[PDB]
Design a protein around this ligand. Structure first.
Ligand SMILES: NC(=O)N1CCN(c2ccc(F)cc2)CC1
Length: 284
């Protein structure tokens, strides 16, 4: 029974290595990673891989690993797939911990934009969680934390993290993680998966997929939002992704909005993440 070596980048930046039979489905590897992580609330998470075009793909747990990674290495990341709109409702602290690690990467990477004050507040809760109570000993007037807090670090941001850290005396790791999440969850790009596209006139837009629906970023002045309820039907054909929108009360016919994606695989990928989010956020 021939087994393939799998390497998984965990949310703390460390590598987990295991073996699975070469005809294994993605669920087999995912179950092994989740057990390694002592994670029970597995529904929010998944494994990503990079395809032959270097795009991030979700590893489908129901399909053979080999028929997804195809010609590529058996190298994966462990990621949040469905960002809970109310992290306080998760049953375990360890779930909330992994969600925090994902969000810290979302922030440092610039996928999750954040004001100066919110970067420093989020930062201060991570420090409280990881080091415990503020200690003046590990912080002179020239302190810079090992912790990555932001896509661009400034001495002013480092100072503001420390100032807010001082206010969190007595806060336990679970408490600090919950405060982190209560703030992060409110950010306008929280849990938003962004896809480059063109509208039916060839104008460059972004399509965002999240818990509440599909977003269309045309410009800062023009953001259309389709709650899952309003979305009747979704489909892809060639390089195109089409969305059917419910008629308003006492309108006869649905509207179709068509989008052009970079290529057929980018269209299919957007279609599948939409399918997944609708099913998830219709059951949650
Ligand atoms: N198999 C079926 O009978 N349905 C058809 C509609 N479909 C859907 C998917 C995504 C979305 F955004 C809106 C609707 C769910 C599956």
């Amino acid at each position: 029974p021939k087994s393939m070596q799998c390497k998984v980048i965990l949310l703390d930046g460390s590598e987990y290595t295991c073996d699975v039979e070469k005809r294994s489905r993605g669920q087999v590897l995912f179950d092994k990673v989740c057990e390694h992580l002592n994670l029970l609330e597995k529904d929010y998470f998944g494994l990503t891989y990079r395809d032959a075009e270097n795009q991030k793909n979700w590893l489908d747990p129901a399909k053979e690993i080999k028929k997804q990674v195809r010609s590529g290495a058996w190298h994966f990341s462990f990621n949040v797939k469905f960002y809970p709109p109310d992290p306080a409702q998760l049953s375990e602290d360890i779930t909330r911990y992994y969600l925090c690690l994902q969000l810290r990467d979302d922030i440092v990477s610039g996928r999750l934009p954040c004001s100066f004050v919110t970067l420093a507040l989020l930062g201060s809760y991570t420090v409280q969680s990881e080091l415990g109570d503020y200690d003046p000993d590990e912080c002179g007037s020239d302190y810079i934390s090992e912790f990555r807090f932001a896509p661009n670090h400034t001495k002013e941001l480092e100072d503001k993290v420390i100032e807010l850290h001082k206010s969190h005396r007595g806060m336990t790791p679970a408490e600090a993680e919950m405060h982190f999440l209560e703030n992060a969850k409110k950010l306008s790009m929280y849990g938003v998966d962004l896809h480059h596209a063109k509208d039916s006139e060839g104008v460059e837009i972004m399509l965002g997929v999240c818990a509440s629906g599909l977003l269309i970023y045309r410009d800062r002045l023009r953001i259309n939002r389709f709650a899952w309820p309003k979305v009747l039907k979704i489909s892809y054909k060639r390089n195109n992704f089409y969305i059917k929108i419910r008629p308003g009360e006492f309108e006869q016919f649905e509207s179709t909005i068509g989008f052009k994606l970079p290529n057929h695989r980018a269209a299919k990928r957007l279609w599948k993440v939409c399918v997944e989010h609708h099913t998830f956020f219709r059951l949650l």
